[PDB]
Amino acid sequence: GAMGSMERASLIQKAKLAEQAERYEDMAAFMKGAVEKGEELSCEERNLLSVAYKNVVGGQRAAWRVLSSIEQKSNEKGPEVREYREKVETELQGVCDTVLGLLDSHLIKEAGDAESRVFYLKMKGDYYRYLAEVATGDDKKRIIDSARSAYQEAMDISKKEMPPTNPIRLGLALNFSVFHYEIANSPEEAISLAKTTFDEAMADLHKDSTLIMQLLRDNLTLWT
Amino acid sequence: GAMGSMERASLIQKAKLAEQAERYEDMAAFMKGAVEKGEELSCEERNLLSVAYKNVVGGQRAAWRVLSSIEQKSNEKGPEVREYREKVETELQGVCDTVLGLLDSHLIAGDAESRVFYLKMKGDYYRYLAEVATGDDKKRIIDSARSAYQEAMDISKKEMPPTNPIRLGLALNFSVFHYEIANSPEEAISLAKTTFDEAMADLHTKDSTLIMQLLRDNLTLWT
């Protein structure tokens, strides 16, 4: 597409340059072209991809929530807020559809490696859940099936290949829990998985993913 | 015209919404709408227009600076950093040229208070341009900011009070151009002086304080 002509190794360097200038909007683009090349990503690369898209899709859900609030506070004045909440909704739908078809068409590969397979399904997980945050109807139904199916198939492959300290499994756990609580209407399972996680982890504390457990606990506080 | 089929009032609520959502690309795009209805912009309105454009052209000026910085240290190689600097420089020039066209084609003989705010803008966006231009281009750009900031000065001088935040901030910016762009630090300094002065004849009649402490804050660095 818009980045076919560019050398792979240059895409990365520009990505990293974007990073510095904080043009995550472009950083994402660069990295997209990066992926489209067909070669597998390094660790350092995955993280750029991740970060660039985290940052874009992030501030999107941010202005959505800002707008979505101002849509409740307007339950006692004009359709303008609904439309502009719709426009932004679209944009986010769009970016998620992008990341989801990268993950699909390239990054989750046949055998792959164990450590990365998980990074990628965690990602599938989150991006189907950001869709869920704003989806509705039967559409919202089908989306949840997908985030679950994903987060799950990752859950399996991580605890059967990683130690409970590994910040990736902690992360994956953490979000799969947020998913249980916030999206799948299961505080029952969300509470119990945040706990099973924070416990088996606090145990083998002999990297520094103590920061992830601080999130796990922070959450469990609000849930009870 | 992507905004063209929306009613003016609506475009404005939508701007304000963008502001609240920190979505300045849109805020700006919305206002570009409002202004292309061909109808005078109110004070509160003129403020979203500059807030929006400032904010966009803001980060564009921040990145180019970041990226020039890298360009130097990394030739004091690979062309990647030059290329992408050029990418960003291009957007920048884009948005200025946009605003500069809004001003020229739609905003400029009104009332005095506003007729300045605009010539002040014309000047500011013509400088940001000159902040990146080169050769014969830069020359003609510099010449243009001078001309607008000037006409602005004249109108701010002939009919505004010396402590009016527009006549002030106008002078502020005109000074910064004098220093950083027209590479005449002489004239920069004895315009900062004159206005941190004719202003200081009234610290009695909270908002001007904000701007005045800048004319000095600047004069710190230029002396």
Ligand SMILES: Cc1ncc(COP(=O)(O)O)c(C=O)c1O
């Ligand atoms: C509202 C507003 N717009 C524009 C500017 C101009 O910015 P700079 O001095 O970096 O060119 C300023 C600052 O002086 C400002 O406060």
